[PDB]
Design a protein around this ligand. Structure first.
Ligand SMILES: Nc1ncnc2c1ncn2[C@@H]1O[C@H](CSCC[C@H](N)C(=O)O)[C@@H](O)[C@H]1O
Ligand SMILES: Nc1ncnc2c1ncn2[C@@H]1O[C@H](CSCC[C@H](N)C(=O)O)[C@@H](O)[C@H]1O
Ligand SMILES: Oc1ccc(C[C@@H]2NCCc3cc(O)c(O)cc32)cc1O
Ligand SMILES: Oc1ccc(C[C@@H]2NCCc3cc(O)c(O)cc32)cc1O
Ligand SMILES: [K+]
Ligand SMILES: [K+]
Ligand SMILES: [K+]
Ligand SMILES: [K+]
Ligand SMILES: [K+]
Lengths: 352, 352
């Protein structure tokens, strides 16, 4: 018949399953740590704090200190926070990865955390089985969970629109420094650049500051431009990139093409190719490159973004070979990849 | 002013945060793998299967094979499944931890997975912040999310009651073999045993089979006994353990005391102490012992269960010192711990 176990089963193997089952506890404990603002209370204090001292500084009163102690115990085991005995008291501090929970610098990841761990925005992941056994539905998991496609949903839910746009703002803050410094030569000779699907303008505001002689434009759907601050020297245009892309010396698209299937990407890439000059025009794509042959620090979260696209947008994350095919099919002459030690890489696509 | 970064920031540190943010993706991809029954289709086939072969055996038709490929790619990166080139084709197999997703043996963990990753049963974790900043509410996160306390909720939601009771059934299946074999001496001389809060009877059915001369009783709330199969030689009694515990030579409580605060536990433990004989009576507690000094395979999920109790039941997981105090305060003479290489340990509590 079947396998019969006769000696002790491996505890580590079973623990690996329990840790996968409860993966959501890491996401949702982290969310609570962010909502309580623990890392910033400690960082501002400048030294480890007792349970009582932390409690006195929390966002509201009163505080259940038993609950706080037990969440902190979990956070210490995550190696995000520390706990030690100092001068006769137990005090809580920050471990090195907690720096990404500290406000005031480009790699603070708080906006992204609050977007991704939002209850409504997690709901699509419960429809993953229905993405494979689709019973002949063509809708995304986002539509099954929340009623309509992501972008129309954002147009009808202003607070959700804002939360998502700030997550994207954050995502872009993580890479701008590397972009404008390491990839400064990409901006040479450009007099105009349009950020297609540029969101609430983080990328253009940073490019415009680093390169004062380039006239920058942000272009997105009306409900996103409506959630943006006013601009002085930067053009803000609203519209639909499938029907119109503002012409310029260069087009940039960050986290756009991974929202769309290959047919749609080719339509967008053709529209971009015809928006830039034959003479040194270029299209700057910023998106993940999936390595399916070797492992990198961001490999796990890049595969996670592949399914995030599958459920939320209808898109995908692509390997270099897939990018090559898409860029070829849109009729470009060639492409060049630049790594910037980020989740995304830069792919410059060059027309004839 | 503030810290200024001047050299490249650590990619691994940032990846650790992204992996915590997306912890829920591991839980919910695993859920989808269980709903698709991938591990059992492969295990029954007895060799790795192509994407097409897997598709032909899935729970329903048609199948989106792109989606299936991409979920499998994530599952292979989890090291739950494998992918290889064999005789000119890409075939998917099982890695060693996938044995816990295979049906037909005591360590199949499928019931637990489907309980813990259920959408409604995950909802309380979104109210973790409100468990610390409770705005002077005394309700559990379960009540905030789902309307009332867990046990009354189960009484009013028969499908949820069943799903939870089968999760508990599974949890008990994981330990019964070690219990009845390693701890056989605990059952010596006992003529009657009552499993207080014994659920749908897994523990008693297994004890009754291993020890045919012990008259076993399962005792739980009416809506749980109502979700149980009929019994011949095993007594099934319904009631409230805070008002009555059926008298017997021994009482067992598995995953009971971790549902309750210390005052409640002492009330239950006193009721048990007075239900067993002064002459060799004993109370057999099966629950986690938290080690807060060193690390073990199950440490992470035990701390996770501490917050699971905090949110869902109002209880907690306890260290040995906390167990000692509780057992002392209920007026017992002593206790003995037996490890059984499981999530829970056995704590025998002995009256005078
Ligand atoms: N048809 C369309 N035309 C223009 N923008 C669109 C669009 N469909 C979606 N978008 C926009 O594409 C963006 C995808 S999210 C990426 C936002 C930003 N580039 C960043 O990386 O931070 C959203 O802001 C969305 O509103
Ligand atoms: N007042 C009460 N009296 C009796 N049983 C109770 C109770 N309150 C809760 N319970 C039961 O305690 C159990 C906790 S879950 C543990 C179930 C089982 N002992 C196992 O380990 O698999 C549930 O079955 C629940 O219905
Ligand atoms: O920094 C982030 C990284 C990834 C996300 C995931 C997000 N899921 C919903 C749909 C969507 C769409 C996107 O184009 C995108 O770049 C990210 C996401 C949010 C973020 O705020
Ligand atoms: O095997 C399992 C392990 C842990 C759980 C968590 C569960 N959360 C809801 C409330 C609750 C209550 C319990 O008494 C318990 O032992 C487990 C749980 C479910 C399971 O099916
Ligand atoms: K959820
Ligand atoms: K809204
Ligand atoms: K990669
Ligand atoms: K129900
Ligand atoms: K432990």
């Amino acid at each position: 018949g079947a396998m019969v176990m006769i000696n002790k089963e491996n505890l580590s193997s079973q623990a690996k399953l329990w840790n996968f089952i409860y993966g959501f506890a890491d996401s949702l404990v982290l969310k609570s740590a962010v909502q309580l603002d623990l890392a910033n209370i400690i960082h501002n204090h400048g030294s480890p704090m007792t349970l009582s001292e932390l409690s006195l500084h929390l966002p509201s009163q009163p505080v259940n200190q038993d609950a706080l102690y037990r969440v902190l115990r979990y956070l210490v085991h995550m190696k995000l926070f520390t706990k030690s005995s100092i001068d006769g008291e137990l005090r809580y501090g920050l471990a090195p990865p907690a720096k990404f929970l500290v406000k005031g610098w480009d790699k603070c990841m708080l906006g992204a955390i609050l977007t991704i761990t939002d209850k409504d925005f997690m709901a699509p992941w419960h429809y993953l089985k229905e993405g494979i056994l689709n019973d002949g539905s063509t809708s995304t998991a986002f539509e099954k969970a929340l009623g309509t496609n992501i972008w129309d949903y954002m147009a009808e839910h202003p607070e959700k629109n804002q939360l998502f746009n700030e997550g994207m703002a954050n995502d872009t803050r993580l890479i701008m420094s590397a972009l404008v410094k390491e990839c400064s030569s990409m901006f040479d000779g450009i007099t105009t650049i349009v950020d297609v699907g540029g969101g609430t303008g983080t990328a253009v505001r940073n490019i415009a500051k680093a390169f004062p002689h380039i006239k920058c434009t942000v272009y997105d759907l009306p409900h996103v431009i409506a959630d943006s601050p006013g601009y002085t020297e930067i053009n803000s245009i609203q519209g639909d990139m499938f029907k119109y892309i503002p012409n310029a010396d260069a087009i940039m698209m960050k986290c756009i093409l991974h929202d769309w299937d290959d047919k749609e990407c080719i339509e967008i890439l053709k529209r971009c190719k015809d928006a830039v000059p034959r003479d040194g025009g270029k299209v700057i794509i910023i998106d993940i490159i999936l390595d399916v042959k070797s492992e990198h620090p961001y490999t796990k979260m890049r595969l996670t973004l592949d399914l995030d696209m599958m459920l939320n947008t209808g898109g995908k994350e692509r390997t270099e070979e897939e990018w090559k095919k898409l860029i070829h099919d849109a009729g470009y002459k060639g492409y060049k990849i630049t790594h910037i030690s980020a989740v995304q890489s830069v792919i410059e696509a060059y027309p004839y």
